[PDB]
């Protein structure tokens, strides 16, 4: 079909650059390429520290403010989890 020795190599490179094979996707490769594609300081928050939306004086990369209503809440949750067991 496509002869090589007659024809010039400056044509042959850009010919065989792009005169490629015909292959579509197969199913096992479709799912396979899909699989390849798959991949503290607590603070009682009273007095001076309260209402501060930032940090208090007392500094650490973790921090947790508390007021008593959380103590009520977590009391209630301890109750109800006991009743859930």
């Amino acid at each position: 079909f496509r002869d090589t020795e007659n024809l010039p190599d400056w044509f042959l490179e850009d010919e065989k650059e792009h005169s490629k094979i015909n292959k579509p996707i197969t199913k096992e490769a479709a799912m396979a390429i899909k699989e390849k594609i798959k991949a503290v300081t607590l603070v009682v928050a009273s007095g001076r520290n309260k209402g501060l939306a930032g940090r208090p004086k007392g500094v650490k990369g973790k921090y947790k403010m508390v007021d008593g209503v959380m103590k009520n809440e977590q009391r209630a949750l301890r109750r109800i989890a006991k009743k859930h067991h």
Partner: protein, 180 residues
Amino acid sequence: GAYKYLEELQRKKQSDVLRFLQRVRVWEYRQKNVIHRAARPTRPDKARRLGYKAKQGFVIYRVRVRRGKYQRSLRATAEERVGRRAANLRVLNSYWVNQDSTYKYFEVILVDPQHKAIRRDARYNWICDPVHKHREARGLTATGKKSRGINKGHKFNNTKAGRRKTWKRQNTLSLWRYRK
């Protein structure tokens, strides 16, 4: 005329002669730029039956795109490319020329609506109305309409009048003054 002789010939795309010619033309265009002008068209009959008439304003550009999930066509992709290039021009339609393993080669019939021959000759005065701007990017040429899914019938219900229009039509609650 030569209309039918040419046409029946170009359907025979795996005769030795046209596949040879295709090989030459691909090498030719591939050394050429991606987008470029042709002054004169390769399938003149095909272009004529898609609405070319050889007079002052009708233009061709010939264009290269990649292959290889893209619910639009390559055809329309090319057409966006040229519409963004020649924005004054207005895209009438397009056609295949040739391909490769790697690329597909296309061609496009365009109009310069400012040109006065076009503004007269009212087979084509319809286009200088402002509406048919950038048709290709709204999908109003024929492949745009295919890919929108616009032909008729109960096969094509989910897109017949615009998918999104009828989606909004049927996924909306209509409520009267006087509830039925």
